Design a protein around this ligand. Sequence first.
Ligand SMILES: NC(N)=NC1=[SH]CC(CSCC/C(N)=N/S(N)(=O)=O)=N1
Ligand SMILES: [Zn+2]
Length: 260
Amino acid sequence: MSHHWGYGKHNGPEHWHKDFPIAKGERQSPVDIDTHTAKYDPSLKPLSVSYDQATSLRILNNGHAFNVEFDDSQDKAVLKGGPLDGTYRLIQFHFHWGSLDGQGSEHTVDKKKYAAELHLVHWNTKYGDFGKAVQQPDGLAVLGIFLKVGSAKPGLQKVVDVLDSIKTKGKSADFTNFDPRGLLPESLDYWTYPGSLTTPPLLECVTWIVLKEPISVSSEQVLKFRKLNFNGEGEPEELMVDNWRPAQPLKNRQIKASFK
Ligand SMILES: NC(N)=NC1=[SH]CC(CSCC/C(N)=N/S(N)(=O)=O)=N1
Ligand SMILES: [Zn+2]
């Protein structure tokens, strides 16, 4: 029980396959996005991001990241279009980030690593609930957005300022009326490919949609991410940093671009 997966030397990504053999599967994520090789697919549609009726509820430190959770019991905040067939409901978002500004993203672009990566996780409403959706090859759609360090992202600050209250694993806080539209870049140009969850159980249920344009966050904003703890309250401090899985083999997949 006590030797659980994580991001350390003894329980990190190179160990995950022992408990989760799908870690060596045929459609694992993340991947490197080779820009010159990705092919423009003129049949891909614009993404439809409809977040105006989003109902955020709570923010949780789960010991690996923090999740901002949404009410997904109705079609409030939904992702449609692009490569997707049907309607995908937003359930949560979270980030992956580094100990230094030169690492932290899960996807890479021509081997470049960004400081962090935002994942907005959505599930296909034809499967009725999230737990059923993760058992399907087209069950989830994760919208990935890169973060670089530069100017502050004003729409991120409300997240940053609540992190002191969920420092340690298992802590949560009310987090209502947060508008995830404030985390998007200007352009919705994207790459897409079939992949997996990037944490155990690593299920091969995700249509990945990775935006081309990064958002900028300030050094102070990402420094606050790095003050979070992997540990629970009253345990030795382990800073929550480098909670990213490295790029996995592309195998028999093609990455498609929505743009020329
Ligand atoms: N609840 C339920 N029935 N199953 C599962 S499997 C993983 C999980 C937690 S959310 C799925 C993990 C995730 N979003 N990975 S990522 N980094 O976005 O690719 N719940
Ligand atoms: Zn993620």
